[PDB]
Amino acid sequence: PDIKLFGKWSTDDVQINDISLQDYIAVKEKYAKYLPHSAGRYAAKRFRKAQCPIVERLTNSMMMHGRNNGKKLMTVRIVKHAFEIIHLLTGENPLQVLVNAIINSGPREDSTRIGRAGTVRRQAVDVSPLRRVNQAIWLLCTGAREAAFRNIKTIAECLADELINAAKGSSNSYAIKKKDELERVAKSNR
């Protein structure tokens, strides 16, 4: 049999173009699930959350942002509606769009901090792939949450637009601006 997310989105055609992030994005045949709700224990051990499917990680990270915590079914429906809107607008697999958005949103180097009472000094350092994935998901969720606030637009459309812009690589998205500014600060501080 074939396993499709929500019964309509296939996972076989999804491919990852970044070699570093292949081992930390779980979308392939072993990690294919019908729903982003498994009731697993992925925070029990270090590095175990890299085995969690990325759709479930996006659902979990979308619960902490701007909501009463613990409402997971609502977040699942929001993700489903966002995927439907993405497919309607673009016409390609929303899983590929999410993977491309996460790949593009991840910073490659950050600035480690040396701070005293007077001033702070800087040093550019590298970023591990797990932190890249975590920070990309956090930036996407924060951008969607801030776009949806105080606007006549439900969170699903803002989230869909955020993934579309991030996967396209356009500068209209919050995550791309955050990534560009962080890498620019790290570049100036070498």
Binding site: T119, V120, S171, Y174, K177, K178, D180, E181, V185, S188
Partner: protein
């Protein structure tokens, strides 16, 4: 596109003499400043007062492309609504700042919306993401033309110090520039800064 101006190191604080509370001024409160050994001549709200007159009467704010932030020496962040007029004369300006620093907000007498409000530090959280952030200092050897630094369609942040002595040094600026070969006042720096932005952005 907008201009963000941050007044860093403002000397704004409230003290009590007799039964009255009033803003700390160098000459008016000379006796109490020497008490406890505080350095005289450091309480200068006038620099903050004079600079806001230059900024908010500039046509750039009149066109709606300017936002002003004040970060005082006591680490209190104040946001300024562009719809506000500053008090032009000094004594009532002390009355406003005493009103603001105590009640944490000042409502419009003519409107429901707030005009002055104390907000959460740091100021870097309130800037639009992707904006350029520039510090200003006379000590920079190279004089940079303001017209060249203006972005075409992006917001930008410029930091001007509100002190007679010292250099601007904050965490979030990535370059420090000089725009003249001479030491200028804080009010003149804002007036010279805002005028170049208008003609680039077509505000005449």
């Amino acid at each position: 596109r907008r201009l963000i101006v941050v007044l860093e190191g403002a000397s704004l604080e409230t003290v009590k003499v007799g039964k009255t509370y009033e803003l700390l001024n160098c000459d008016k409160h000379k006796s109490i400043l020497l008490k406890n050994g505080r350095d005289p001549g450091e309480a200068r709200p006038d620099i903050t007062h004079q600079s806001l007159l230059m900024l908010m009467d500039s046509p750039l704010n009149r066109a709606g492309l300017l936002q002003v932030y004040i970060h005082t020496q006591k680490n209190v962040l104040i946001e300024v609504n562009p719809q506000t007029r500053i008090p032009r004369t000094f004594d009532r300006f002390c009355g406003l700042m005493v009103q603001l620093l105590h009640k944490l907000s000042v409502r419009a007498a003519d409107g429901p919306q707030k005009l002055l409000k104390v907000i959460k530090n740091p100021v870097s959280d309130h800037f639009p993401v992707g904006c350029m952030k520039v510090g200003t200092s006379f000590s920079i050897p190279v004089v940079s033309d303001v017209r060249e630094l203006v972005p075409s369609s992006d917001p930008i942040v410029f930091v001007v110090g509100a002190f007679a002595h010292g250099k601007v040094s904050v965490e979030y600026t990535e370059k420090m520039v000089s725009i003249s070969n001479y030491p200028l006042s804080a009010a003149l720096t804002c007036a010279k800064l805002t005028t170049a932005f208008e003609e680039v952005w077509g505000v005449i």
